[PDB]
Amino acid sequence: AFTVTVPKDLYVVEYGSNMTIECKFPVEKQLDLAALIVYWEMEDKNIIQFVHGEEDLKVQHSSYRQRARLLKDQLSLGNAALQITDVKLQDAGVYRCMISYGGADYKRITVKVNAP
């Protein structure tokens, strides 16, 4: 039916770097932005709420404001790519993309943060 995939399921990133984590979803021909819903969450923090073709930033957790955003132009390729700039120690944890595009599915990604 509708499956969401992740290239890797664990990312180890250095403190202060930028990271891009990816979720893939099925896209048949062009893209129905009306149909597309994306949610990124980690731990109990609201990262990204994208639904019915529109962004919502007021719901975003304050620690990610202006630091985290969803990379749109890959979506037409079936890629929900969350980029976080200037990774902090507190960005370590378990993330989860949730995609609705007709069907719905989600995957989990673990992030590990170093320090040097």
């Binding site: 819903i37 609201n46 007021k58």
Partner: peptide
Amino acid sequence: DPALWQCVFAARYCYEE
């Protein structure tokens, strides 16, 4: 499912802000 996710995203927004 997107309903449930928007239910939870809105619930936390109430808590945070």
